[PDB]
Amino acid sequence: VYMSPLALNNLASRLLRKISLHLVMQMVTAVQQDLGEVVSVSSNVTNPASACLVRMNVQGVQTLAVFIAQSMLNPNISYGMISGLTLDCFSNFIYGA
């Protein structure tokens, strides 16, 4: 398979078609409402903690998981391009963590 493009393309094509994950998650809302309490979000103040609670979407988790999944089936079909690798990204604890 690794000797012929065509052959490998089909391997990859099929490797992907098969992927199926079944996840259950809370309501996007309720999680906000909960951390919202844990941090004490002032609906007037803009602060790190507060801000991130909005870039919180479900679609992201989908994409992320599926990736984690394939990336685990065969290392030679695909690679990921990480976004936002600023010079000092690590000084943003959230992103960092």
Binding site: I19, V24, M25, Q26, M27, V58, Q62, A65
Partner: peptide, 12 residues
């Protein structure tokens, strides 16, 4: 009503 389940690789 708390958990909404998702089948992934969905074209929502």
């Amino acid at each position: 009503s708390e958990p909404f389940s998702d089948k992934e690789r969905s074209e929502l």
